[PDB]
């Protein structure tokens, strides 16, 4: 996600159609190694966006992909104080999710 083309609003956005298409740099394959723990954390294996060539990107968003932009429900927005941006150039991008889980329920 590009953070100048989209500004995150945590309450008023609900579904994929809220994100303006210009803010999309790339879209992943579905997650794998999906697991849960008694502490309420969700875990998954690292996610690869292959051969990416958009503009500079500053965040990631996780969503339940229903295959339709009306019901494809947003789950979480993530960024970091130190991993502030990625500058695409035809590299692959890996998102290496935090070891102990990335989202809590």
């Amino acid at each position: 996600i590009d953070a100048d083309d989209y500004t995150v609003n945590l309450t008023s956005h609900t579904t994929l159609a809220n994100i303006p298409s210009g803010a999309i740099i790339a879209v992943s394959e579905s997650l794998t190694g999906k697991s849960v723990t008694s502490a309420g954390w969700v875990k998954a294996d690292p996610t690869v966006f292959p051969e990416v060539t958009g503009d500079t990107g500053e965040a990631v968003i996780v969503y339940k992909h229903t295959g339709t932009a009306s019901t494809s429900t947003l789950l979480s927005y993530h960024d970091s104080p130190t991993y502030q941006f990625v500058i695409p150039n035809g590299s692959d991008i890996r998102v290496i999710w935090p070891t102990d889980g990335f989202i809590r329920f």
Binding site: H78, V86, G90, R94, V95, F102, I103, R104
Partner: protein, 475 residues
């Protein structure tokens, strides 16, 4: 009466320069490895009146005066050897327009190491040899940036701290942060990479002394901090003012000249390592050269993208020696010197992440800003992108620097996967593209795959939220 001091003699010649004191020391030099001198070194004691003892031999003092055996290392295979030698030969004096009288190469890999010197200094009956010193140039930036990352790891400074805390009077010093210095998001103008009037007097009078901090305090910012990235000498100079400040606050006060040479020499064991106070290096040294060049061609070599734009052709017919240069043109950039073994030792320590935590050593391999995008002009020129990291330039799986000082081009890169180090050095200012092209060719010879794109690593922070609840009321 009174001991004036001691004299040391070897084979009957006085190796000492003036009488040494009761805790002073003489170094005897040019000895061969693995050999015994206990029968050849002798000592005398001398009185204020000039009375001297017999020369007692170190054997009579039971002192074990023998040199260390020459430390062995497993070499690169013979086929690789001659392919490297053929690559270096294509960058040197007899091949067409390749104005460089001599070269050095230093390689370490998991499968062995090679060190060689080629050509000469233009001295009459003396080809290059590996004991000789050269200017490390801009590779000194990897010595400076790393100690600042040690001070972030020690919490003595932090990523959002503004430059106005450490030094007075810098333009936009209220908006320039520690992160923006380390990543070249500093907006400041460059005196060697961006000023024709300065570049002229640097080429025409390299021994003139200079105050680049005074240039910074007069300068107009090129852009607002954090909005772009561009190569900067001002950044590394200003890191050399955040260091010194830490040494006044937390250590014992030193200049950047003192502290950078002390830490790297004592920790890594780089015995050649020095920052010249005179216009000349410690002996013996490689001699620097340049052809005479028009100002439009000098600008093309000192500019930030010079290693790509190498097609200068060099039609001129007179040459200048460029051994003598003032380190004040560079300060914490540019200024270190030493020889090839110590330069490869420096690259090995930068791979190993010396001075740094495991968390910081992960971070410095992963945060980057854009240096250049280019179409690769051949198969050995790597991914069409290079980026400034927290202490190196990146090119595929290789981290390193490209640099020069007057007449010397020096390149130092190492590989994140193998831990291999490649070092290249050329005697001539005209060689700025050729030294980097030689690194690319040795990297492509040793490991083709390492010259592809690096993967970007992004780590999101986790999404906690509060356990917010309310309690019902009973009636």
């Amino acid at each position: 009466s009174g001991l004036r001091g001691y004299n040391v003699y070897r084979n009957g010649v006085r190796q000492n320069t003036s009488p040494v004191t009761e805790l002073g020391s003489v170094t005897i030099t040019g000895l061969t490895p693995g050999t015994d001198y206990s029968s050849q070194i002798t000592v005398t004691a001398i009185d204020m009146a000039g009375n001297e003892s017999e020369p007692k031999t170190l054997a009579e003092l039971e002192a074990e005066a023998a040199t260390d055996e020459l430390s062995p290392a497993d070499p690169l295979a013979p086929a690789v050897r001659a392919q490297i030698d053929a690559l270096v030969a294509a960058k040197m004096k007899p091949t067409s327009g390749k104005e460089a009288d001599g070269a050095m190469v230093g390689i370490e890999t998991p499968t062995g190491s090679y060190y060689k010197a080629y050509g000469g200094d233009r001295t009459k009956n003396q080809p290059l040899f590996l004991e000789q010193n050269f200017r490390y140039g801009s590779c000194s930036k990897m010595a400076c940036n790393t100690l600042l990352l040690r001070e972030i790891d020690r919490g003595h400074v932090d990523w959002d701290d503004t430059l106005d805390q450490f030094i007075d009077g810098i333009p936009n010093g209220d908006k320039i942060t520690v992160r923006y210095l380390l990543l070249f998001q500093d907006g400041l103008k460059d005196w060697l990479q961006g000023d024709p009037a300065v570049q002229q007097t640097y080429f025409l009078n390299p021994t003139l002394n200079y105050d680049p901090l005074a240039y910074i305090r007069a300068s107009t910012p090129v852009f607002e901090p954090g909005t772009d990235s561009h190569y900067s000498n001002a950044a590394t100079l200003l890191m050399g003012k955040i260091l010194e400040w830490c040494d006044a606050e937390f250590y014992t006060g030193r200049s950047a000249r003192e502290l950078i040479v002390e830490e790297w020499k004592n920790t890594v064991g780089m015995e050649s390592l020095h920052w010249p106070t005179t216009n000349y290096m410690n002996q013996p040294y490689v001699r620097g050269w340049t052809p005479n060049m028009a100002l439009p061609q000098i600008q093309a070599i000192l500019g930030p993208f010079a290693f790509l734009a190498g097609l200068l052709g060099y039609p001129t017919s007179k040459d200048l020696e460029w051994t003598a240069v003032s380190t004040t043109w560079s300060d914490a950039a540019g200024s270190l010197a030493g020889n090839m073994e110590d330069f490869v030792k420096f690259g090995k320590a930068l791979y190993e992440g010396e001075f740094l935590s495991e968390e910081m050593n992960q971070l410095r391999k992963e945060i980057f800003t854009r240096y250049v995008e280019y179409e690769p002009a051949g198969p050995h020129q790597g991914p069409g992108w290079m980026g400034f990291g927290l202490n190196s330039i990146c090119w595929g799986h290789w981290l390193g620097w490209v640099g020069n000082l007057g007449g010397y081009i020096a390149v130092l890169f190492y590989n994140q996967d193998d831990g291999s180090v490649i070092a290249t050095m050329l005697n001539n200012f005209a060689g700025h593209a050729d030294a980097v092209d030689l690194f690319y060719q040795i990297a492509y010879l040793l490991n083709p795959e390492s010259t592809g794109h690096r993967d970007w690593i992004f780590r999101p922070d986790p999404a906690e939220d509060a356990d917010e609840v309310r309690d019902p009321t009973l009636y």
